[PDB]
Amino acid sequence: VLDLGALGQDFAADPYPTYARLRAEGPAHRVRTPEGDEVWLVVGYDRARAVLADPRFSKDWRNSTTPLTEAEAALNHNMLESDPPRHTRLRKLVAREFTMRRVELLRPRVQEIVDGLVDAMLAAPDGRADLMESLAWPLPITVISELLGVPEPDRAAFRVWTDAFVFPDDPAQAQTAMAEMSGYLSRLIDSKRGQDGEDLLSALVRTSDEDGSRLTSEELLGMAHILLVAGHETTVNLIANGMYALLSHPDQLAALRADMTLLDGAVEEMLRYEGPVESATYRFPVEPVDLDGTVIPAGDTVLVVLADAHRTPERFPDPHRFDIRRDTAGHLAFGHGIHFCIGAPLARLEARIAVRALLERCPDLALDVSPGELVWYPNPMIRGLKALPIRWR
Ligand code: HEM
Numbered sequence: 001v002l003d004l005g006a007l008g009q010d011f012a013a014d015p016y017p018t019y020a021r022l023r024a025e026g027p028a029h030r031v032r033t034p035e036g037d038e039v040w041l042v043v044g045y046d047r048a049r050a051v052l053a054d055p056r057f058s059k060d061w062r063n064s065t066t067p068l069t070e071a072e073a074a075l076n077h078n079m080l081e082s083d084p085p086r087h088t089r090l091r092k093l094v095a096r097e098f099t100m101r102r103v104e105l106l107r108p109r110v111q112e113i114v115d116g117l118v119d120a121m122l123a124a125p126d127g128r129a130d131l132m133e134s135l136a137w138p139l140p141i142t143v144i145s146e147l148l149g150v151p152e153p154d155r156a157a158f159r160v161w162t163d164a165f166v167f168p169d170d171p172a173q174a175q176t177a178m179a180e181m182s183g184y185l186s187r188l189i190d191s192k193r194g195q196d197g198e199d200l201l202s203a204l205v206r207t208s209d210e211d212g213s214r215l216t217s218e219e220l221l222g223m224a225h226i227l228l229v230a231g232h233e234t235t236v237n238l239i240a241n242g243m244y245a246l247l248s249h250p251d252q253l254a255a256l257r258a259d260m261t262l263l264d265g266a267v268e269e270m271l272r273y274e275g276p277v278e279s280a281t282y283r284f285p286v287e288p289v290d291l292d293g294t295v296i297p298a299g300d301t302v303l304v305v306l307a308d309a310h311r312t313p314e315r316f317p318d319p320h321r322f323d324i325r326r327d328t329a330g331h332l333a334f335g336h337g338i339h340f341c342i343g344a345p346l347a348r349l350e351a352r353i354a355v356r357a358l359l360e361r362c363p364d365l366a367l368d369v370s371p372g373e374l375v376w377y378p379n380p381m382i383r384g385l386k387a388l389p390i391r392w393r
C-alpha cells in the first residue's frame, strides 16, 4: 500500500514519475489516497484502455463493498454510476443534446461568452490576472448553467459545493456539501415542474412526469448532478491545465500563435499531456480479476490512471514532450467504451474558442509565476490548479 497522502504536494504537482515506476513493476497496485481509502491504480496505456471498456469492471455501486453514504445514495442513479441496461437508457435520454450538431448551434453563444470574459480580463490596469478566476471557471459554469436552466443568482453556489465535494478537508465536509447541493437541485427540479421552460432540466422533468418508467425522480436528480459536475469542473481544468501547458512551453505557444490551424491538435495534446481527468471514475470488479498475476478482489475500488496511459512511451513516443503537432489518436482523456464522454464536442468547442481568444488578444501572453509557485489539488482523480497567474503586454 503506497500512501499517496504521505507523498504530499510533490506527487500532486508531478505524479507522473510515481505512476511510471509503478507501471514498470506491474499493471495494478494497492494505494491509499490522501483521504485514507485503499484503492487500486491501473497503469499503462494498453491495460488502462482494456480495463475502461471491460464489462468485468462495473460502475454500479451495488458491485462495491464500500457502502454509499446517505447523501451519495441520493445521487448515484446516473449513467456514469450505472451499467447496462440502466446505463443504456439513461445515456439515451440525453444522447442527442451533446452531438457535434447541437453543440455547433452553441458556437455563437460560446464565442460571445468568451469575447466578453476576455474583454473584462484585458481591462485589468497592470496587464495581470488569474486565468482561473477570469476565464477558466466562469466560461463552463456559464455555458452549462444556460443549458440546464440554472438561474444566474444560484450559479455561485455551484463553485463552492463543487469545490467542497471535489476537494474537501474531510470526507465529512463533502457530505454536507453534497447534501446541500442535492437539497438545492431537488428544489430546482420542483420549480421547473410543468412550468414549460425550454432548458434541458425542464425537458427532463417533463420526461420523468410523463413516463416515470423512462426516468425516476431519483434519476432526474442524478442526471442533473452529473451533467453539472462535468460541464464545469473537468472543462475548467482542461482550459487552465492546457493553457498552463502552453505557457510553460514558450516554444509551442509561439508555434500555435503563428498558425491557428494548429489549434485542434494543440487542444488534443493538452488533453493528452495535462488532461483534467488524472484517474477515471470508480470501477468495481464483479468477480475477482487477475491482471497479469495480480488479482484484484471483487468489490474493491479501481482507478484507471489516464495520466499514466498518456505517458506510456510505446504508445506516445517521447511522452514527456509537449508537442502540439503530435499524433494523439486514441488517447483516453474522454474515456473509452460505453461510458465515453458524451460532452466531448462541447468541451472541445469551449477550450478551442478560449485558447484562440487568449492567444489572439493577449500580446506576449506569459506565465506570471514560476511553476514552483503553483498549487495543484491532491485528489488523485482530478489534475487541477488552485490559480493560474498570467500577464500580457
Ligand atoms: C474537458 C472536459 C471533459 C473531460 C476531460 C471529460 C472526461 C470524461 C471521462 C474520462 C469520462 C468517462 C469516465 C470513466 O470512464 O470513468 C466522461 C464521461 C461523461 N461525461 Fe465528460 N468530460 C469532459 C466534459 C464534459 C461535459 C462538458 C459534459 C456535459 C455535457 C460531460 C458529460 C459526461 C457524462 C454525462 C459522462 C458519463 C457518460 C456515460 O456514462 O455514458 N463531460 N467524461
Ligand SMILES: CC[C@H]1OC(=O)[C@H](C)[C@@H](OC(=O)CCN(C)C)[C@@H](C)C[C@@H](C)C(=O)/C=C/[C@H]1C
Binding pocket: 072, 073, 075, 076, 080, 081, 165, 166, 225, 226, 227, 229, 230, 233, 234, 277, 281, 381, 382
Ligand atoms: C460525468 C463525467 C464526470 O464524472 C462525475 O461527475 C463523477 C461521477 C462525480 O462523482 C460523483 O458525483 C459521486 C456520486 N456518487 C458517489 C454517488 C465527480 C464528483 C467525480 C470527480 C472525480 C470528477 O470531478 C469527475 C468528472 C468527470 C469524470
